[PDB]
Design a binder for this molecule. Structure first.
Ligand SMILES: Cc1cc2nc3c(=O)[nH]c(=O)nc-3n(C[C@H](O)[C@H](O)[C@H](O)COP(=O)(O)OP(=O)(O)OC[C@H]3O[C@@H](n4cnc5c(N)ncnc54)[C@H](O)[C@@H]3O)c2cc1C
Ligand SMILES: Cc1cc(N)c2cccc(F)c2n1
Length: 437
């Protein structure tokens, strides 16, 4: 199936790879692009897997969802008709984009511009993108628990995880989410909606004082925790898991503070590990501070190799070295890498945003360096507001709380890098007419 040579080779079949393929085809008409994906699915977007796909009846099979406005669409970036087969990729007139599903790149040879797949086949390339993303982390307490505890613990990232968990929500009476970040909180609201209708139980526990405490200031994290609780979720903050075992057919979670939680299924949402296995054979540098492949401002690692998406630790000329795990960042960085694979030599400049919805009622957007450890200034009108994240009297990140269609304004504030004497006047740019943390 796989051709022996391809001009553009993209490793990984996710958001960053698809955005690069589209970018290569737009900037280089007639380009021949091969995506190698270890997953069996064609490229698809992940945000709906914890949101819109849960707020729909045949959705598990169709994988179509209604945006909050009402317009329906598919989770796949393009229908299969958009792609061509890998075998025919060298011969089709005006080229195309092919995906080799079910195949993993296991070896990378930078000197000879060659990769080896898990089935032994070898592919040479002229330009290559590493877009391998990451794999969910698991808790040490779950790893040492046993095969039964591990078989009843879900690490949520893929279409298969959505389907297996959606079925579980219709079979068991109690599901426990471990993790207070974006993913855990969105799954809590999603599973909580399903549980109100079926009369089941949803628990969310995490070590922080409130949901997304590592990201939002304490007061807003606490407000968010109460919103999640009003969705029918039992939220247990300040919870550190000591051990997990099976007791009377149920899962028993023992916390360090002495509390105990009985449940039927566990969903672990405790972060991501960048997929950097190819750095060994490839001789590529990994970043010990942020993880991931270390690349420069143009997302380049070596002469004919770029890295994009969750796996790329890059140099932001304005904000410094970073690694970002956002859907839009994978789109922006994948697109940029694609342009640089066709001669652009452009640095990461356009700042990608992220968003989170805890239902169709609570939503927030964000841009830049967003970290609750940074000094923050929040101007609210509760209901809505804007939180500025500061570094040396300069706004380096913004969180928009239930304020939409104003991300271009936030993007400009980060870019301009002004020293603002009155942030209440800057908040007026977001139609907000003050808390510190
Ligand atoms: C459930 C969920 C909800 C999310 N919601 C949001 C949201 O609301 N807002 C937001 O901003 N972000 C959200 N994100 C984050 C966003 O989805 C990620 O930032 C984005 O998917 C990263 O794209 P990527 O291309 O870098 O990696 P991935 O999408 O992970 O793609 C990597 C692909 O490469 C494959 N691969 C890995 N190694 C190899 C190899 N050696 N050979 C072949 N293939 C390989 C992997 O199997 C995977 O198929 C969400 C993520 C998840 C999981
Ligand atoms: C930056 C970001 C924002 C989200 N809303 C999100 C939701 C689920 C899983 C994730 F990894 C997420 N990451």
């Amino acid at each position: 199936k796989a051709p022996s040579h391809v001009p553009f080779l993209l490793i990984g079949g996710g958001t960053a790879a698809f955005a690069a393929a589209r970018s290569i085809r737009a900037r280089d008409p007639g380009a021949r692009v091969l995506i190698v994906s270890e997953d069996p699915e064609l490229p698809y977007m992940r945000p709906p897997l914890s949101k819109e796909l849960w707020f729909s009846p045949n959705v598990t099979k169709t994988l179509r969802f209604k945006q909050w406005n009402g317009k329906e669409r598919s989770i796949y970036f393009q229908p299969p008709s958009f792609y061509v087969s890998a075998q025919d990729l060298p011969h089709i007139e005006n080229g195309g984009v092919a995906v080799l599903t079910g195949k993993k790149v296991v070896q990378l040879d930078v000197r000879d511009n060659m990769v080896k797949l898990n089935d032994g086949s070898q592919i040479t390339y002229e330009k290559c993108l590493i877009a391998t993303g990451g794999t969910p982390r698991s808790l040490s307490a779950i790893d040492r628990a046993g095969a039964e505890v591990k078989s009843r613990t879900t690490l949520f990232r893929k279409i298969g995880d959505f389907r297996s968990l959606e079925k579980i929500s219709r079979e068991v009476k109690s599901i426990t989410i471990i993790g207070g970040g974006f993913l855990g909180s969105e799954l809590a609201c999603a599973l909580g909606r399903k549980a109100r209708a079926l009369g089941t139980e949803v628990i969310q526990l995490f070590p922080e004082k409130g949901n997304m405490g590592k990201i939002l200031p304490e007061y807003l994290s606490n407000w968010t925790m109460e919103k999640v609780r009003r969705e029918g979720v039992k939220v247990m903050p300040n919870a550190i898991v000591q051990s997990v075992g099976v007791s009377s057919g149920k899962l028993l979670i023992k916390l360090k503070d002495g509390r105990k939680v009985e449940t039927d299924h566990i969903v672990a949402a405790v972060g991501l590990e960048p997929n950097v296995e190819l750095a060994k054979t490839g001789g590529l540098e990994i970043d010990s501070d942020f993880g991931g492949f270390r690349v420069n401002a143009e997302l380049q690692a070596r002469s004919n190799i770029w890295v994009a998406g969750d796996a790329a630790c890059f140099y932001d000329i304005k904000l410094g070295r970073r690694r970002v795990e956002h859907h839009d960042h994978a789109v922006v960085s994948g697109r940029l890498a694609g342009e640089n694979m066709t001669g652009a030599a452009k640095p990461y400049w356009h700042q990608s945003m992220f968003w989170s919805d805890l239902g169709p009622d609570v939503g927030y957007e964000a841009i830049g360096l967003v970290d609750s450890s940074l000094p923050t200034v929040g101007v609210f009108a509760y209901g809505k507001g804007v939180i500025f994240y500061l570094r040396d009297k300069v706004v380096v990140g913004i969180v928009l709380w239930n304020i939409f269609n104003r991300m271009p304004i936030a993007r400009k504030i980060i870019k301009d890098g002004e020293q603002h004497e009155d942030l209440n006047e800057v908040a007026k740019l977001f139609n907000i007419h003050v808390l510190f943390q």
